[PDB]
Design a protein around this ligand. Structure first.
Ligand SMILES: [Cl-]
Ligand SMILES: [Cl-]
Ligand SMILES: [Cl-]
Ligand SMILES: [Cl-]
Ligand SMILES: [Cl-]
Ligand SMILES: [Cl-]
Ligand SMILES: [Cl-]
Ligand SMILES: [Cl-]
Ligand SMILES: [Cl-]
Ligand SMILES: [Cl-]
Length: 189
């Protein structure tokens, strides 16, 4: 069995982050879904943090994805932290109310507020993607991966989205990557 194992449900955005990164690197890996947080194991290493798992997999296995100059890495680095620190919480809330709770249980005012704030948060990324074609800068790299794994849910969710055309063209370019198709575009349950 491959040295790399990734535990976790494939319909989680955090696990998508890791599967997509694994796929981008081409390495042998096992994905275990037991019957949400990814657990990475690679030899003696055990990782529980999505973005740490990403940064590791790219630096260790896909150096095309890990910019070596600190100043260029920092461009996409900030969107990795921002995805966790600012976007994921409100969006996971939006996504729960819409895909996973029964209408009898939906706090609509809250969903409505999640949807509205999700949108204006994303407007910030949309503005950055009007300056460069990737969160990582001129070329795709690890920095695009955390928000890229959420933005699949954003666009394929049954919701009314505000017009964010740079964000959308970026998602269109993500969709042409096979690693993104196999790693991220899973059952949106
Ligand atoms: Cl989600
Ligand atoms: Cl099951
Ligand atoms: Cl190792
Ligand atoms: Cl439901
Ligand atoms: Cl551009
Ligand atoms: Cl770059
Ligand atoms: Cl849709
Ligand atoms: Cl479309
Ligand atoms: Cl997979
Ligand atoms: Cl599907």
């Amino acid at each position: 069995m491959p040295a790399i194992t990734i535990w976790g449900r494939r319909n989680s955005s955090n696990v998508r982050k890791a599967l997509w990164c694994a796929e981008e690197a081409g390495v042998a890996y096992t994905s275990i879904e037991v019957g949400v947080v990814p657990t990475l194991q690679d030899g003696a290493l055990v990782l529980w943090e999505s973005n740490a798992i990403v940064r590791y997999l790219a630096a260790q296995y896909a150096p095309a994805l890990y910019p070596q100059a600190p100043a260029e890495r920092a461009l996409g680095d900030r969107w990795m932290d921002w995805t966790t620190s600012t976007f994921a919480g409100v969006f996971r809330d939006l996504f729960w109310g819409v895909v996973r709770t029964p209408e009898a249980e939906r706090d609509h005012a809250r969903i409505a507020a999640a949807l509205t704030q999700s949108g204006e948060l994303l407007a910030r990324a949309d503005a950055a993607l009007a300056q460069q074609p990737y969160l990582s800068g001129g070329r795709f790299a690890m920095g695009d991966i955390p928000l890229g794994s959420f933005i699949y849910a954003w666009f394929e969710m049954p919701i009314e989205r505000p017009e964010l055309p740079h964000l959308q063209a970026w998602y269109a370019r993500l969709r042409v990557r096979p690693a993104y198709q196999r790693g991220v575009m899973t059952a949106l349950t």
